[PDB]
Amino acid sequence: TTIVGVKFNNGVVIAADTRSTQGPIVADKNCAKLHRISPKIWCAGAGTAADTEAVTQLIGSNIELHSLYTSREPRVVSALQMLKQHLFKYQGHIGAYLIVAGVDPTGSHLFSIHAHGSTDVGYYLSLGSGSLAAMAVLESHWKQDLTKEEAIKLASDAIQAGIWNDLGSGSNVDVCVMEIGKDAEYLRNYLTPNVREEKQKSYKFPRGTTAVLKESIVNICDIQEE
Amino acid sequence: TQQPIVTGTSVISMKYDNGVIIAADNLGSYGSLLRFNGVERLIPVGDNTVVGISGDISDMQHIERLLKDLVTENAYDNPLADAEEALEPSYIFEYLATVMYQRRSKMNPLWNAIIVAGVQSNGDQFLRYVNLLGVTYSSPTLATGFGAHMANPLLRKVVDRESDIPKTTVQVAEEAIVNAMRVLYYRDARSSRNFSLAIIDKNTGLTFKKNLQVENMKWDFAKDIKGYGTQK
Amino acid sequence: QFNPYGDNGGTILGIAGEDFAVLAGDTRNITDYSINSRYEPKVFDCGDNIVMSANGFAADGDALVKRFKNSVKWYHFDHNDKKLSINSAARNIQHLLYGKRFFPYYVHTIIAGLDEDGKGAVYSFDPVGSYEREQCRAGGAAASLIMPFLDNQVNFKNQYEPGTNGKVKKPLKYLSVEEVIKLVRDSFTSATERHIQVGDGLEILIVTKDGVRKEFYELKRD
Amino acid sequence: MDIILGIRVQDSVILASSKAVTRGISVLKDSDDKTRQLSPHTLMSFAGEAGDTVQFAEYIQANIQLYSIREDYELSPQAVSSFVRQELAKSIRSRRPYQVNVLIGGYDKKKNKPELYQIDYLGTKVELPYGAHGYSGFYTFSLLDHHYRPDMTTEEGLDLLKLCVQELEKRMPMDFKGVIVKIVDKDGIRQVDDF
Amino acid sequence: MDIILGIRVQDSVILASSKAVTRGISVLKDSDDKTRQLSPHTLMSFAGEAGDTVQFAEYIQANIQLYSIREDYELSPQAVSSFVRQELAKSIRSRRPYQVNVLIGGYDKKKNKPELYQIDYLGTKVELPYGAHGYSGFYTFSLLDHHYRPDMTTEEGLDLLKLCVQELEKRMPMDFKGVIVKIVDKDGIRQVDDF
Amino acid sequence: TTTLAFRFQGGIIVAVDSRATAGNWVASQTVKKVIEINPFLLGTMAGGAADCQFWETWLGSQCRLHELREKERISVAAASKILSNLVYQYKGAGLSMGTMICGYTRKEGPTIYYVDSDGTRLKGDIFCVGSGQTFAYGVLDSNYKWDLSVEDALYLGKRSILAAAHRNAYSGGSVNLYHVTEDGWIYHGNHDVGELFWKVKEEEGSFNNVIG
Amino acid sequence: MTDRYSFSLTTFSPSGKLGQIDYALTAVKQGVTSLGIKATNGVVIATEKKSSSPLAMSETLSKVSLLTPDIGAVYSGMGPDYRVLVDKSRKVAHTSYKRIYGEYPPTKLLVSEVAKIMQEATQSG
Amino acid sequence: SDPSSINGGIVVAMTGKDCVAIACDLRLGSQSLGVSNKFEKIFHYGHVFLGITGLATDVTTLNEMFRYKTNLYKLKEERAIEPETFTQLVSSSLYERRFGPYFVGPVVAGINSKSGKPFIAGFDLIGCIDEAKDFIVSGTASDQLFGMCESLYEPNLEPEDLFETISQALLNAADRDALSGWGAVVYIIKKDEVVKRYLKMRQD
Amino acid sequence: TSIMAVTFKDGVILGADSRTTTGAYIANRVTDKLTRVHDKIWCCRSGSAADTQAIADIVQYHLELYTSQYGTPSTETAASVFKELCYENKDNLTAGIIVAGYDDKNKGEVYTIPLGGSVHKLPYAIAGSGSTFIYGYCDKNFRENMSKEETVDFIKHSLSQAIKWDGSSGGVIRMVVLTAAGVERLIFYPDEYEQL
Amino acid sequence: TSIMAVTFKDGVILGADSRTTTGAYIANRVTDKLTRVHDKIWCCRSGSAADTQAIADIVQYHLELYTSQYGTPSTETAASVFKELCYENKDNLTAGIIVAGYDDKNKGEVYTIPLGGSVHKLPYAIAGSGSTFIYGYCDKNFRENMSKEETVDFIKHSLSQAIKWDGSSGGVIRMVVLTAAGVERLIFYPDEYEQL
Ligand SMILES: [Mg+2]
Ligand SMILES: [Mg+2]
Ligand SMILES: [Mg+2]
Ligand SMILES: [Mg+2]
Numbered sequence A: 001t002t003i004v005g006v007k008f009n010n011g012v013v014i015a016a017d018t019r020s021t022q023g024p025i026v027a028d029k030n031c032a033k034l035h036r037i038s039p040k041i042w043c044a045g046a047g048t049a050a051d052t053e054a055v056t057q058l059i060g061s062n063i064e065l066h067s068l069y070t071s072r073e074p075r076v077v078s079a080l081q082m083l084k085q086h087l088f089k090y091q092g093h094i095g096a097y098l099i100v101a102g103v104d105p106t107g108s109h110l111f112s113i114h115a116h117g118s119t120d121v122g123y124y125l126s127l128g129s130g131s132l133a134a135m136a137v138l139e140s141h142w143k144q145d146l147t148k149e150e151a152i153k154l155a156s157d158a159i160q161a162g163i164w165n166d167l168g169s170g171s172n173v174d175v176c177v178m179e180i181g182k183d184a185e186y187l188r189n190y191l192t193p194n195v196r197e198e199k200q201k202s203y204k205f206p207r208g209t210t211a212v213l214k215e216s217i218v219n220i221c222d223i224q225e226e
Numbered sequence B: 001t002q003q004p005i006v007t008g009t010s011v012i013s014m015k016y017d018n019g020v021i022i023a024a025d026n027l028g029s030y031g032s033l034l035r036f037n038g039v040e041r042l043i044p045v046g047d048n049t050v051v052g053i054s055g056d057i058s059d060m061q062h063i064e065r066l067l068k069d070l071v072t073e074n075a076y077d078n079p080l081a082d083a084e085e086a087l088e089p090s091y092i093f094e095y096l097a098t099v100m101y102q103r104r105s106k107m108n109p110l111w112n113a114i115i116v117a118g119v120q121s122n123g124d125q126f127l128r129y130v131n132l133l134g135v136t137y138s139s140p141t142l143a144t145g146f147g148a149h150m151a152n153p154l155l156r157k158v159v160d161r162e163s164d165i166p167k168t169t170v171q172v173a174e175e176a177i178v179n180a181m182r183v184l185y186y187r188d189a190r191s192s193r194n195f196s197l198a199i200i201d202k203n204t205g206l207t208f209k210k211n212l213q214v215e216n217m218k219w220d221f222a223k224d225i226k227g228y229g230t231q232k
Numbered sequence C: 001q002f003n004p005y006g007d008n009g010g011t012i013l014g015i016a017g018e019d020f021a022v023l024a025g026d027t028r029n030i031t032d033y034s035i036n037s038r039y040e041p042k043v044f045d046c047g048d049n050i051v052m053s054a055n056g057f058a059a060d061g062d063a064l065v066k067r068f069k070n071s072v073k074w075y076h077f078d079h080n081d082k083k084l085s086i087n088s089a090a091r092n093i094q095h096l097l098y099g100k101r102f103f104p105y106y107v108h109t110i111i112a113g114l115d116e117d118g119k120g121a122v123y124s125f126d127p128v129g130s131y132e133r134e135q136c137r138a139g140g141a142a143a144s145l146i147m148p149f150l151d152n153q154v155n156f157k158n159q160y161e162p163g164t165n166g167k168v169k170k171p172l173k174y175l176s177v178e179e180v181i182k183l184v185r186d187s188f189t190s191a192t193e194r195h196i197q198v199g200d201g202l203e204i205l206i207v208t209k210d211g212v213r214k215e216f217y218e219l220k221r222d
Numbered sequence D, E: 001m002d003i004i005l006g007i008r009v010q011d012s013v014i015l016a017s018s019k020a021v022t023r024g025i026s027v028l029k030d031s032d033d034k035t036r037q038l039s040p041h042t043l044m045s046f047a048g049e050a051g052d053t054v055q056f057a058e059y060i061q062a063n064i065q066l067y068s069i070r071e072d073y074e075l076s077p078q079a080v081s082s083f084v085r086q087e088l089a090k091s092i093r094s095r096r097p098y099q100v101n102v103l104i105g106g107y108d109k110k111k112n113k114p115e116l117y118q119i120d121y122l123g124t125k126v127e128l129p130y131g132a133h134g135y136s137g138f139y140t141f142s143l144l145d146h147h148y149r150p151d152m153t154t155e156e157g158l159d160l161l162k163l164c165v166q167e168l169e170k171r172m173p174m175d176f177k178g179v180i181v182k183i184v185d186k187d188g189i190r191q192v193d194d195f
Numbered sequence F: 001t002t003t004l005a006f007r008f009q010g011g012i013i014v015a016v017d018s019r020a021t022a023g024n025w026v027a028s029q030t031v032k033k034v035i036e037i038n039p040f041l042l043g044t045m046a047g048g049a050a051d052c053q054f055w056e057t058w059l060g061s062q063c064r065l066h067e068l069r070e071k072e073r074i075s076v077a078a079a080s081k082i083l084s085n086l087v088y089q090y091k092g093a094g095l096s097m098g099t100m101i102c103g104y105t106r107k108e109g110p111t112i113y114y115v116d117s118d119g120t121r122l123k124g125d126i127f128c129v130g131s132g133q134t135f136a137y138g139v140l141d142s143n144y145k146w147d148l149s150v151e152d153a154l155y156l157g158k159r160s161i162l163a164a165a166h167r168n169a170y171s172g173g174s175v176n177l178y179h180v181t182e183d184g185w186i187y188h189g190n191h192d193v194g195e196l197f198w199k200v201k202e203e204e205g206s207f208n209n210v211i212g
Numbered sequence G: 001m002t003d004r005y006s007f008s009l010t011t012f013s014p015s016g017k018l019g020q021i022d023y024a025l026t027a028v029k030q031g032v033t034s035l036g037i038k039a040t041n042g043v044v045i046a047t048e049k050k051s052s053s054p055l056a057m058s059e060t061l062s063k064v065s066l067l068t069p070d071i072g073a074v075y076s077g078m079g080p081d082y083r084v085l086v087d088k089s090r091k092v093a094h095t096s097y098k099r100i101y102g103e104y105p106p107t108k109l110l111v112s113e114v115a116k117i118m119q120e121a122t123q124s125g
Numbered sequence H: 001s002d003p004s005s006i007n008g009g010i011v012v013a014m015t016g017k018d019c020v021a022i023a024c025d026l027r028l029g030s031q032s033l034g035v036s037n038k039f040e041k042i043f044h045y046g047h048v049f050l051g052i053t054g055l056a057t058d059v060t061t062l063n064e065m066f067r068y069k070t071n072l073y074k075l076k077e078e079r080a081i082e083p084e085t086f087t088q089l090v091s092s093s094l095y096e097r098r099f100g101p102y103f104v105g106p107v108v109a110g111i112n113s114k115s116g117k118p119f120i121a122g123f124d125l126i127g128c129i130d131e132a133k134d135f136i137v138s139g140t141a142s143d144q145l146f147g148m149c150e151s152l153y154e155p156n157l158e159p160e161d162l163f164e165t166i167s168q169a170l171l172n173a174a175d176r177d178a179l180s181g182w183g184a185v186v187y188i189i190k191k192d193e194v195v196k197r198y199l200k201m202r203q204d
Numbered sequence I, J: 001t002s003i004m005a006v007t008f009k010d011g012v013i014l015g016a017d018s019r020t021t022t023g024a025y026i027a028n029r030v031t032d033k034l035t036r037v038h039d040k041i042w043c044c045r046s047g048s049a050a051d052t053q054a055i056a057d058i059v060q061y062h063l064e065l066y067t068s069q070y071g072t073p074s075t076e077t078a079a080s081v082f083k084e085l086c087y088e089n090k091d092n093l094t095a096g097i098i099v100a101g102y103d104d105k106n107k108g109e110v111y112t113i114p115l116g117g118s119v120h121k122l123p124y125a126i127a128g129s130g131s132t133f134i135y136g137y138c139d140k141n142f143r144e145n146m147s148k149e150e151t152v153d154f155i156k157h158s159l160s161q162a163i164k165w166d167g168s169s170g171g172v173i174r175m176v177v178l179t180a181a182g183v184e185r186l187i188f189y190p191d192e193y194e195q196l
Helices: A049-070 A076-089 A131-141 A148-165 B057-075 B089-105 B146-156 B170-187 B220-224 C058-078 C086-098 C143-153 C177-194 D052-071 D077-091 D136-147 D154-171 E052-071 E077-091 E136-147 E154-171 F049-070 F076-089 F133-143 F150-167 F193-204 G019-030 G079-101 G107-120 H056-077 H083-095 H142-152 H159-174 I049-070 I075-088 I129-141 I148-165 J049-070 J075-088 J129-141 J148-165
Strands: A003-008 A011-017 A020-022 A025-028 A034-038 A041-047 A096-104 A107-113 A119-121 A124-127 A173-179 A185-191 A212-218 B006-008 B011-016 B019-025 B028-030 B033-036 B042-045 B049-056 B112-119 B125-131 B136-138 B141-143 B194-201 B205-213 C011-016 C021-026 C029-031 C034-037 C051-056 C107-114 C120-125 C131-134 C136-140 C201-208 C211-218 D004-008 D012-018 D021-023 D026-029 D035-039 D042-048 D100-108 D113-119 D125-127 D130-132 D179-185 D188-192 E004-008 E012-018 E021-023 E026-029 E035-039 E042-048 E100-108 E113-119 E125-127 E130-132 E179-185 E188-192 F003-008 F011-016 F020-022 F025-028 F034-038 F041-044 F098-105 F109-116 F121-124 F126-129 F174-181 F184-192 G034-039 G042-047 G065-068 G071-073 H010-016 H019-025 H028-030 H033-036 H042-045 H048-054 H104-111 H118-123 H135-139 H184-190 H193-199 I003-008 I011-016 I020-022 I025-028 I034-038 I041-047 I095-102 I108-113 I120-122 I124-127 I173-179 I182-188 J003-008 J011-016 J020-022 J025-028 J034-038 J041-047 J095-102 J108-113 J120-122 J124-127 J173-179 J182-188
Touching (some): A003 A096, A003 A131, A003 A148, A011 A034, A011 A041, A011 A096, A011 A107, A011 A148, A025 C177, A025 H142, A034 A049, A034 A096, A034 A173, A041 A049, A041 A173, A049 A076, A049 A096, A049 G079, A076 A096, A076 A107, A076 I049, A096 A124, A107 A124, A131 B170, A148 A173, A148 A185, A148 B146, B011 B049, B011 B125, B011 B146, B011 B170, B019 B042, B019 B049, B019 B112, B019 B125, B019 B170, B033 I148, B042 B057, B042 B194, B042 B205, B049 B194, B057 B089, B057 B112, B089 B112, B089 B125, B089 C058, B112 B194, B125 B141, B136 C034, B136 C058, B141 B146, B146 B170, B170 B194, B170 I025, C011 C051, C011 C120, C011 C177, C021 C051, C021 C177, C086 C107, C086 C131, C086 F049, C107 C201, C120 C136, C136 C143, C143 H159, C177 C211, C177 H142, D004 D100, D004 D113, D004 D154, D012 D100, D012 D113, D035 D052, D042 D052, D042 D077, D042 D179, D052 D077, D077 D113, D077 D125, D077 H056, D100 D179, D136 F133, D136 F150, D136 H033, D154 D179, D154 E026, D154 F133, E004 E042, E004 E100, E004 E113, E004 E154, E012 E100, E012 E113, E012 E154, E026 F133, E035 E052, E042 E052, E042 E077, E042 E179, E052 E100, E077 E100, E077 E113, E077 E125, E136 E154, E154 E179, F003 F098, F003 F109, F003 F133, F003 F150, F011 F041, F011 F098, F011 F109, F011 F150, F041 F049, F076 F121, F098 F126, F098 F174, F109 F126, F121 F126, F126 F133, F133 F150, F150 F174, F174 F193, F184 F193, G065 G079, G079 G107, G107 H056, H010 H048, H010 H104, H010 H118, H010 H142, H010 H159, H019 H042, H019 H048, H019 H104, H019 H159, H042 H056, H048 H135, H056 H083, H056 H104, H083 H104, H083 H118, H104 H135, H118 H135, H142 H159, H159 H184, H159 H193, I003 I041, I003 I129, I003 I148, I011 I034, I011 I041, I011 I095, I011 I108, I011 I148, I034 I049, I034 I173, I041 I049, I049 I075, I049 I095, I075 I095, I075 I108, I095 I124, I095 I173, I108 I124, I120 I124, I124 I129, I129 I148, I129 J129, I129 J148, I148 I173, I148 J129, J003 J041, J003 J108, J003 J129, J011 J034, J011 J041, J011 J095, J011 J148, J034 J173, J041 J049, J041 J075, J049 J075, J049 J095, J075 J095, J095 J124, J120 J124, J124 J129, J129 J148
Antiparallel strands (some): A003 A124, A011 A173, A020 A025, A034 A041, A041 A096, A096 A107, A107 A119, A173 A185, B006 B028, B011 B141, B028 B033, B112 B125, B125 B136, C011 C021, C021 C201, C029 C034, C051 C107, C107 C120, C201 C211, D004 D130, D012 D179, D021 D026, D035 D042, D042 D100, D100 D113, D113 D125, D179 D188, E004 E012, E004 E130, E012 E179, E035 E042, E042 E100, E100 E113, E179 E188, F003 F011, F003 F126, F011 F174, F020 F025, F034 F041, F098 F109, F109 F121, G034 G042, G065 G071, H019 H184, H028 H033, H042 H048, H048 H104, H104 H118, I003 I011, I003 I124, I011 I173, I020 I025, I034 I041, I041 I095, I173 I182, J003 J011, J003 J124, J011 J173, J020 J025, J034 J041, J108 J120, J173 J182
């Protein structure tokens, strides 16, 4: 997994690759790692995939109720405080490593959070097995006062470094841009540089190739009238 | 079987159109203690080869002596020792690789990762890796330790495959190497600011640069960073 | 504690035709989650119309190939330049491997060529020297992904003739070199999609009575 | 405990269970009955860790007898086996699991069919024509796979069972001191007193 | 291997040894003779680790046969037992010790006396009226302590031996597939073919 | 793995399965588990594949040297003991071997020796070795007679491997049959278990538990 | 301390009436009028913002509340009781449905959950 | 010892044109010992199909649990649960046992009754959802299935072509796994008809 | 990590490096280890980042609730709350915290709370992995009642040496000055302190 | 143990504490850790006392046999012999040795040989458990071409701090001065160096 977060002029951008693996085997070639905590607070997860998803939805659920209770739009610091206190309580057993980014009435924010409950602030962050490849790109090209277009470019380039150089990362680049005073724009499959080439042969079988012992209709309908 | 005591971090290298570049910092770490600050980890062999070594420094010094002895031995009864029968990068590597694999096979390794950079008699670039396990491989860019994780991605953006090598000048290659060393200084806790860089070119020969420093560093943005979440 | 072994990934595939044999392998070399090289040759022409690959721990792989090549050279010296037949090479490799029975070459070895009747031959070895002549053998990381596909598409396993419904098997008709290369390419393309250690490039060595020919194909680099 | 075998024939279920009880060095008993009647037409044999086997078997017996009194009705073999499976599935994630494997032989009076259920200590249930637990199946299943027919009589089932026991007595290192054999059919449960 | 028993009566030594050979799960053989004739009037039974037992026994046999040819003379049972003890005492501090326990039953033609020697794998030698190795003594010694007399006939020795085997067959968990019984006396060595 | 060998009126039947596994992964279905030591001697493969292959081939070399020096066929007793003495030297080093050395000579008749990597050497009439040995023993024990015909003995060996192949997950692929006579062994073909199972089910009426 | 009222405060009178429920309905009757109308392509709910004082900012008092993105609620009767029911209704939509099925509850089932809460205040101690 | 490979078995699911297919082997074993050749691993609740590989006691327990929950769902909702909703229910149910999980590899397959869209999904033992467009695999021969599916699969296969593809994927994968086989079943699922086919395969 | 707090004439100054490592990888090179628990009560954190953040947040909550009821807490009180958390949960914590604060009555005060959860009031304190290398230097160079400029130089020179020798320390030198005048943040970059 | 060797204008001076501990027990409080391997080639020993004594004795033998054949050995040569023993037997040794010597041609030279058996020529070297606490101090205070009196003060002050913080170091500060003039032994007692 390669995930990055990059601050820019009027907001923040988050990006991720789309490979999920089980050991050396690729389970899903187009996984969605960018998750929504709230409309304008998004995060990307590395580590135990179930934990990253579960902790996002739990805090996202409580954030929504908190937003309704307070009649205020949710803040990134609230998501952050709720995530870290939940994770700290479970002493790293919930293997969620997240980059949290978003905009709120206070402004634009970018945080990382680790499984044991520690958090960090930054203008650029990377997480996952491809984080070193991504951070190499970020440390080479990041500057202060990036534009929206420059930040999207930098973020996706950092993910690409992970895709090509980290075996744990691959396939596509997903991006989400959160700009102040605007709707967050989720860009699913922003880049697609790994389409499989056409195979040399069609493996469609002739009908009747497989040996069959018995056939029967399965009753999926309910108990019928009359 | 042993454990490394005094250690050197990344060695990084790449091919370019007319030769090879190799670089390594001047630190000898003692665990987390940055003990020795004037350690040369690039060792030239003749005027056509530079051997870059990471890992255990005591084993590095042993290898350095083996290479010194190799030059002495090659000159014995050899009228063409400074001409046709001079040591090639390929000879030096194969010798080291033999030693490394033999030593691992006796369960007593030289605890190192080694990159042999040089130019052959016919002008061909030579760049190959060997380590404590006797594992060997070649690539347009090669790096050890942290360099493998952080330098290679950056260097591979310049030379991504074999066909990029003739398109890469010595200025672009050196620039990429120097930037990679800066990135490693930002991110490797066992690195130093001081490093050595060696260029082996088929036209201009061996250029050995000592006492280089990481420069043009970005730190100013640190002033705005406060707390770890909620603190203003 | 010092671990004398490592895993350099890689996947190899040998297929024996009627009057030819292919030995293919990806050119990617790795440790853990890093790529060492996108092109590090793994299948070698050893002379006497024999091709070899020792997949797994690359240091042991290179050592074995080097010693076998050496054995071919000395076989020529000791036996009046006699050609080393594929069966004799296979038995010789068994002894090279079993010589280190208690400190094994951590590799899965495959050799390919032609037997003394000119028919395609592939031999497969375990790390300590147990070997067999086989028609079809994948080795290494993605072997479990490739072999079932080869059982189905080379040997026509579980395939029956339409209309008979399991009574008549699909007949085992001989495959051309072009047909085998298609199955090799599709095997590695599929393996590249689902296995992280497979990719970058595919190099195929084809052995016939005319000699050894090479073919290279790009694989996905992610 | 050691060997427990089961075979479902045409009109009955036959359970064979070893008589030996060994505590380490010595064989303490050679007439132990490793079974409990759960209901008039349902019998359960058992093998596993000492103490837990009988404790589990009697606990099940007590519960099925309670159900029988409350409803004035005998549960089907299937219903009993499902109840037993749940208890074992519950047990495997407990503080200290019941280390007990069981066979449930019953005659369903509604369907007029014999039924044999094999359940291990994890709560792994399967309905079988013949079954076993431990190493018993390793020696006996090749014989059962060969000779078994679904239309066998009770007498033929007993003869096939004798062949299985003979093979066990030949190739098994442990002396299990023979087996007690019981038959479950429409008339209930009875013991074969000469085997 | 498992049970090896020995009893020295008035005019002979009787050795009883189990017939079973078990390799883990299966009983591979039920007619194994766990003994070697070292000389015409000296027999050695053995039990211990697989392979080592026969290797040791045949090595001893070869050495005693060599001595017999060289000197044209049969060594006394005492002399043979001392030779065997030294080999085992030597073995216990070797790189890989012989894990073999033996009984040596011999008839001394000079003294006209039967003699039974018990030696374990450490080289612990004792001359006894009756002996065993492993767990065999735990079941049989109470019977031997009760019934044994030094003036017993060979037939009485065999009857007492049968009682010991019966007690073993009752209380031992393992099926050792009966015993081969051999008698050593002034006329040499012979096997009791019905036991 | 399932390998067996039994003595009978017409000599020796040797039957083996063909499956090799690495964990749950089926590495091969076409393994040769009978080692043709020479035209008169057979060995079976169980435990370590290399150990069996290597040392039983080596055994063939020793047997050949014996008959060159002594101008006489080596006995099964002598051949089996050369192997058992060899592996006994290596005891503790980690060899893995469970094999039946099978032969038929003038002085001995049909003879089988179970040889094993902890040094065991046992002469016997019926042996079964491997993960599926218990299944094959059941069929063997209940159907074995000395006065079996060569045809019925061959089938019994085939049927016993099939029993094991069906029940034991690590046995299967195909069945290899051999008949050992005084004038040498005779190969009786490779029999795919998949095809054999259905054939035997129908013709014999066995495996009623399995739907076909 | 401890809540020592573990008994029902709503009970059946001799005539079969549950007094406290009837009196609660009387309180609803005194409350400001609210209504709901269902159309083919929507539903409307409305009420009067009866401002207690002109100095009060009646926009800060929400009589019509979002429960889920597709469900809204209005009331008549005691405002504070409504406010806490809205808090409970919003939460139960998550805890007993969205955290299980990954989607918001259908109207009838959320109503069923709110109804259950109100029923329990009629029987609990 | 490893709970996910004691009993063995496999499940595979595939999408086609206006159809889905889900298939499984029939083996239940105790490591090397084959115990049952009639242990079906696919279940259905209304029109939603669930395959479950792994520890057999948990397979049975989870089936009973989801029957329990989908029956209550139906009584309250007054409609049958959909594949998308059921997938979330499986995920939620597995994750609630985060630190004492069911050792299983579930696979959901079905067609949404309102949109008509084919749907498949897979899970790890603690509920992480894999919602693939093409295919989902699970069990002790998952590597083999990944290999077969990756090469044999193509999009928009007709029901009777999809049957052949998924059958050959299962069969040949199973024949390279010691702990899978002993029979196989394939479900071909269309919007308002489902066909179930038992396959003939080698019994070793 | 290299952290220190030094009392001087006008109050107290906290100092810290900015390096946070995961093994040999620098996970954050611009970390802020100087943490505010009250207006003029701050702390330097060493050990587990998760633990020390958790502790600091709880302390900040306690002092916020203290202030609402009883007015501004003393530095001693803040140290006591830190100690209570560190001592009572010593089995499950890896935290080495220095507490520094300014009162008007007490002026500048420094308390160090090592691993065990003991409290030690000191004129100055050093902690973290890098502190080992500057025990000699700091002991030789510290004086009581230094000026602001002298104390800044003392901390700058001290942490420079700690950074030079400790691989786990590095980046920028952050400082927070606590006096009657208020709260001042200072930052010093590598090009400045490396040439000292 | 706290040991150091410092080159200066007229040659080199070796310095050491005198404490030898077995756990927390001081087995010898007046140990001489400054060991003579040749007339003007000495060494400071740290690590296993058995190992470093064994090594020093072997080196002394080698240099004695060297001298009989080839005349006075260089300090580099002595360091090489030390290194050969330490490197080749690294698996079975726990020795950290500083070699210091005076030639007339080369003047004062210092070589440090840490645990692995590597060699490092330095202007000055520090080693032993107590050296950790004075890396900062020594780096700040060392100058090249100091006078004899300055070098004695530098070593005295340095080892004083090492002794102050390291429980494994203590006792007297021994020193050996190596110059053209000859070999001078110095000793400094606790009452002197503790008040520095
Ligand atoms: Mg790949
Ligand atoms: Mg099988
Ligand atoms: Mg299978
Ligand atoms: Mg540093």
